Amino acid sequence: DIPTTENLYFQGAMSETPRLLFVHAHPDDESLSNGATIAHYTSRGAQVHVVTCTLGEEGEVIGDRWAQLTADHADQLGGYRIGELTAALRALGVSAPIYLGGAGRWRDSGMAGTDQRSQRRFVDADPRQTVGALVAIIRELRPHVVVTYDPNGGYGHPDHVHTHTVTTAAVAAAGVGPGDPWTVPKFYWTVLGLSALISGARALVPDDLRPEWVLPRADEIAFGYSDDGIDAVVEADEQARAAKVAALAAHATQVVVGPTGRAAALSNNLALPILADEHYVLAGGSAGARDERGWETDLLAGLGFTASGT
Ligand SMILES: CCCCCCCCO[C@@H]1O[C@H](CO)[C@@H](O)[C@H](O)[C@H]1O
């Protein structure tokens, strides 16, 4: 027996469910950057997909159990992180991971410095193949909204910068010419909202942090955006923030979530607040309604989606 269902959205006179696509470099980037936004939309019935460009084979590992999986040892961390990503996405309401070009196609490029005995690094990949692979995904899923890193790739990791480059080119090529062309309605860059981070970090209390963690300072955040530079914000509810916390917890080899779930830290022990609001810059398409801050409050703003019956 097929379970009874109801179409939740209409776009004009046709039932049409919003589709969003987030493109990230490594496993856990989706949770750290857009976890609350993804959970926000999936819980509202929107179809959300996450594309991860690499397995994150060059990552470090927290703890001793999986320490020998690192690249300088057994070099099997990428395969192990597939499970962490799968569990993280499930926590956010996303079905399964989507690896660009197939899982294992292009390797984590690393943060530069260490060995690099690899003939398949994402940053060194032929744009014809990477852009081609992403175009196929975009034409298949036909996303109303695509999200990726800004030109500086957030912190500046080589793979984040490259993800921006490939996604930008793919969005541009997707509608020119899983076969028919598709022009993406809205294209955003996920960015760090400086003012939100500041108040968020200051609001953290002793029990939210482990004794060895330290809150970041100015010279540790040179890629934040001012409220003037931000174009949109998704202010999710506590349910969505809780899903983000759960997603982060799933990336056990990369992140440590505080005892109260209000903060988390990476291997560098740099504690960051786990906030419900995530910020964006409109990179392509026309914006919907803006609030008093001059920000849209829904990535789907202006696309004409309405709840069925309204
Ligand atoms: C149990 C989950 C119920 C989800 C009901 C879907 C609510 C949809 O709500 C609609 O979403 C659109 C796009 O975000 C907005 O533009 C509309 O203003 C809003 O009413």
UniProtKB/Swiss-Prot annotation:
Cofactors demanded by this protein = Zn(2+)
What disulfide bonds does the UniProt entry report for this chain? none
Instruction: Tell me its EC number(s), please.
Output: 3.5.1.103
Paste the cofactor note: Binds 1 zinc ion per subunit.
EC top class named in words: hydrolase
Q: Name one GO biological process term.
A: mycothiol biosynthetic process
Q: Which keywords label this protein? A: Hydrolase, Metal-binding, Zinc
Which InterPro entries would you find in this protein's record? GlcNAc_PI_deacetylase-related, LmbE-like_dom_sf, Mycothiol_biosynthesis_MshB
Residues where Zn(2+) binds = 26, 29, 160
Does the record's keyword annotation contain Metal-binding? yes
- The superkingdom of the source organism is Bacteria
Q: Which reaction does it catalyse?
A: 1D-myo-inositol 2-acetamido-2-deoxy-alpha-D-glucopyranoside + H2O = 1D-myo-inositol 2-amino-2-deoxy-alpha-D-glucopyranoside + acetate
Q: Does the keyword Aminoacyl-tRNA synthetase apply?
A: no
Single GO MF annotation: N-acetylglucosaminylinositol deacetylase activity
Describe, as the record does, how this protein assembles with itself and its partners.
Homodimer.
**Family of this protein:** Belongs to the MshB deacetylase family.
Summarizing the function annotation, the protein's role is: Catalyzes the deacetylation of 1D-myo-inositol 2-acetamido-2-deoxy-alpha-D-glucopyranoside (GlcNAc-Ins) in the mycothiol (MSH) biosynthesis pathway. Shows some amidase activity toward S-conjugates of mycothiol.
Q: Know the name of this protein? A: 1D-myo-inositol 2-acetamido-2-deoxy-alpha-D-glucopyranoside deacetylase
Q: Which organism is it from?
A: Mycobacterium tuberculosis (strain CDC 1551 / Oshkosh)
